């Protein structure tokens, strides 16, 4: 059995982009186990200890003007540069969602049922899903799974509507996403 | 608000002597550096035809991370990390239709340290054909995420489980899935 204690060290450089690359913030951070110890915030301009363990390092790294200067320009030489390098396949990546509608469990009419609107394989995550009953939007009884990131640059989400289907009713799932100009719609007739 | 985030994340773990170097875009992995083959591995093949990255730089960074971990361990007075067991969820990547190729996704989330053993089981027996997985993805709370995949052919005859082993768990965890 393995019970030996573990020691973890993490280093993260996070580039935050606002309004394209008009506004950029760089956040450099070191985490001992699960505790951030020291960081460099481009908005601050120098290293700052977060915990007592990072005191020595912030004082040390801040004493090297060379490091500070390089770090203060990383917002341009690093952040903006990488944004440009990957823009075409990341920032601009677009994959259309596949929309399917089906009732949860096959039950006879006039009985409570959960209508499932499955939206999958899309990218980016920004998406809007709405349910309509005979042309009118149903804002209540909507059970959403939320955004699910599949780990392969694809998302999925299941938005269910609580209903009591009655013959003649037409239920429509409407989906808006950056990959399509007009919203996608799939109808299910009771 | 905020439109995008790119993250260069790396770690080194003792005594396992495990390291990792990767780039992340809005929660998705752009690429990571294979420590054994010392090469850049793109999450999606096409990424490599649009950009490049010298794996060497990553290897040099890891050497420093290893050295910093040593220093910090002693400085913390050998304070070990507290294991945080993972949340595990199994889903298909699309609505399942009998006899239609699909993929089972084992989502392992919110855990640390970044060490797990995952195996797929079909009717109780390990399966390896076509399986793949991601490296450890970073989280804002500094815990990790990891995905395991299993291509399969849906049927009413088979049952699957994602078996996950982690030090934060008292016993191996099995997440079940079967056609309903």
């Amino acid at each position: 059995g393995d019970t030996r204690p573990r020691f973890l060290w993490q280093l993260k450089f996070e580039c935050h982009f606002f309004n394209g690359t008009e506004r950029v913030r760089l956040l450099e951070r070191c985490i001992y186990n699960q505790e951030e110890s020291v960081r460099f915030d481009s908005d601050v301009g120098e290293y700052r200890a977060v915990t007592e363990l990072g005191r020595p390092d912030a004082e040390y790294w801040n004493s090297q003007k060379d490091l500070l200067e390089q770090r203060r320009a990383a917002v341009d030489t690093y952040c903006r540069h990488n944004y440009g390098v990957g823009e075409s396949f990341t920032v601009q990546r677009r994959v259309e969602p596949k929309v399917t509608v089906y009732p949860s469990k096959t039950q006879p009419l006039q009985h409570h049922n959960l209508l499932v609107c499955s939206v999958s394989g899309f990218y980016p995550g920004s998406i809007e899903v709405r349910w309509f009953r005979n042309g009118q939007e149903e804002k209540a009884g909507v059970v959403s799974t939320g955004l699910i990131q599949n780990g392969d640059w694809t998302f999925q989400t299941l938005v269910m509507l609580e209903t009591v289907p009655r013959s003649g009713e037409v239920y429509t799932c409407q989906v808006e996403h950056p990959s399509v100009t007009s919203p996608l719609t799939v109808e299910w007739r009771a | 608000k905020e439109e995008h985030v790119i993250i260069q994340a790396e770690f080194y773990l003792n005594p396992d002597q495990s390291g990792e170097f990767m780039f992340d875009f809005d929660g998705d992995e752009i690429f990571h550096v294979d420590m054994a083959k010392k090469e850049t591995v793109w999450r999606l093949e096409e990424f490599g035809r649009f950009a490049s990255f010298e794996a060497q730089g990553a290897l040099a960074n890891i050497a420093v991370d290893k050295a910093n971990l040593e220093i910090m361990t002693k400085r913390s007075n050998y304070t070990p990390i507290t294991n945080v067991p993972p949340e595990v969820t199994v889903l298909t990547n699309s609505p399942v239709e009998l006899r239609e190729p699909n993929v089972l996704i084992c989502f392992i989330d919110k855990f640390t340290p970044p060490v797990v053993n995952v195996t797929w089981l079909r009717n109780g027996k390990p399966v390896t054909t076509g399986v793949s997985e991601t490296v450890f993805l970073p989280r804002e709370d500094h815990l990790f995420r990891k995905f395991h995949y299993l291509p399969f052919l849906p049927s009413t005859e088979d049952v699957y489980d994602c078996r996950v082993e982690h030090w934060g768990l008292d016993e191996p965890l099995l997440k079940h899935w079967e056609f309903d």
Binding site: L11, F13, E28, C30, P56, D57, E59, Y60, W61, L67, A74, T77, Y78, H81, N82, G84, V85, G86 | Q8, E10, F23, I30, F50, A51, S52, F53, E54, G57, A58, A60, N61, V64, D65, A67, N68, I71, M72
Partner: peptide, 13 residues
């Protein structure tokens, strides 16, 4: 185009 990486600095002694 190539990705640039930020180099890690060694901690205090």
């Amino acid at each position: 185009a190539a990705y640039s990486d930020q180099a890690t600095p060694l901690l205090l002694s």
